[PDB]
């Protein structure tokens, strides 16, 4: 209990799992402000100013960009899941053998 | 109307802007908007509106636009490449010729 | 090109070459996992062999 209490970094690998997921979602939210070539990051400020033949051109830029943002999240989240799966297999092995 | 070399400006504020009224000034040869549709103006609200007025030749009307160059665009009346607003022009041969 | 359009083609180059960087990083993340597994095995054999 003393070696755990006197060293805040002792569990600094379970906290990393928490921190990585938390910042991954914050990254997504902060990317909604990007315009991706559009006149505006706000969808309702495009349709309210431009006509249909023009608004669609601007809106498609936001859709394409944001789809890539989500795809990046999924890909990296999937790679990280594999890392945890590997450590879970080790933990199960040690439960059995130790 | 002012000469193009010394174009006039009027400040518009604290008013209700009805844009359906000015479609009866002429055959209405040119009406081109930047950053906004001609038909959405009635639904919007602006912080500052300025009206710049002058007389030029018909073949010089094309110079009153973003990205344009020439004697009028460079020496008399220049618009910014980020201009937002509408350009209105009509033939006034019946009034401005002798 | 005039600014209003020039920035559009530039924006296209940015997203294109940016996606390229992204492919590089993604592949390195996968490749890194392969190396780590090997390193973990090498460490295990050091201890046991």
The method of structure determination was: cryo-EM
Cα B38–B58–B90 angle (5° rounding)? 40
Q: Can you tell me the distance from the alpha carbon of A50 to that of C38, in angstroms, rounded to the nearest whole number?
A: 57
Residue that has been written with the tokens 């400006």 in this structure? B9
Closest chain B CA to residue A54: B37
Q: Within an 8 Å CB–CB cutoff, is residue C2 touching chain B?
A: yes
> B: neighbours with 3+ CB pairs under 8 Å?
A, C
Q: Give contacts of A39 with chain B, Cβ < 8 Å.
A: 35
Both tokens of A70, joined, read: 């989500």
Cα A33–A36–A40 angle (5° rounding)? 55
Q: Within an 8 Å CB–CB cutoff, is residue A95 touching chain C?
A: no
Backbone angles phi, psi at C7, to 5 degrees: -65, -20
| C23 CA: distance to closest CA in chain B (Å) | 34
Q: Can you tell me the distance from the alpha carbon of C4 to that of B86, in angstroms, rounded to the nearest whole number?
A: 16
Resolution of the coordinates, Å? 3.1
| A77 CA: distance to closest CA in chain C (Å) | 12
Closest chain C CA to residue B67: C2
Q: Residue C40 to residues A90, B91, C43: CA-CA distances in angstroms?
A: 11, 82, 5
Of A37, A68, A75, the CB nearest to C8: A37
Residue that has been written with the tokens 């002012």 in this structure? B2
Question: Between chain B and chain C, how many beta carbons pairs sit less than 8 Å apart?
Answer: 10
Q: Within an 8 Å CB–CB cutoff, is residue A48 touching chain B?
A: yes
Give the closest residue to A70 by CA, choosing from A41, A32, A16, A22: A32
Q: Residue C28 to residues A16, A74, A87, C21: CA-CA distances in angstroms?
A: 21, 16, 20, 11
Collapsed DSSP state (helix, strand, coil) of residue A13: coil
| B67 CA: distance to closest CA in chain C (Å) | 6
Long-range CB contacts (< 8 A, 24+ apart) of B63-68?
B64/B89, B65/B32, B66/B34, B66/C2, B66/C3, B66/C4, B67/C2, B67/C3, B67/C4
Name residues 57-96 of chain B within 8 A of C (Cβ).
66-67, 81-82
Residue B14 is classified by DSSP as S
């Amino acid at each position: 209990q003393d070696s755990l209490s006197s060293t805040p970094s002792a569990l600094g690998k379970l906290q990393d799992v928490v921190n990585h997921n938390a910042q991954a979602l914050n990254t997504l939210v902060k990317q909604l402000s990007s315009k991706f070539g559009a006149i505006s990051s706000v969808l309702n400020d495009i349709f309210s100013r431009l006509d249909k033949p023009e608004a669609e051109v601007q809106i498609d830029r936001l859709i394409t960009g944001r789809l890539q943002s989500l795809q990046t999240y999924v890909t990296q989240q999937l790679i990280r899941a594999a890392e945890i799966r590997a450590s879970a297999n080790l933990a199960a092995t040690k439960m059995s053998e130790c | 109307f002012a000469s193009v070399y010394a174009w006039n400006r009027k400040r518009i504020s604290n008013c209700v802007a009805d844009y359906s009224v000015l479609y009866n000034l002429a055959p209405f040869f040119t009406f081109k908007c930047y950053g906004v549709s001609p038909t959405k103006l009635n639904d919007l609200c602006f912080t500052n509106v300025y009206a710049d007025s002058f007389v030029i030749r018909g073949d010089e009307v094309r110079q009153i636009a973003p990205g344009q160059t020439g004697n009028i665009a460079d020496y008399n009346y220049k618009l910014p490449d980020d201009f937002t607003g509408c350009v209105i022009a009509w033939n006034s041969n019946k009034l401005d010729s002798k």
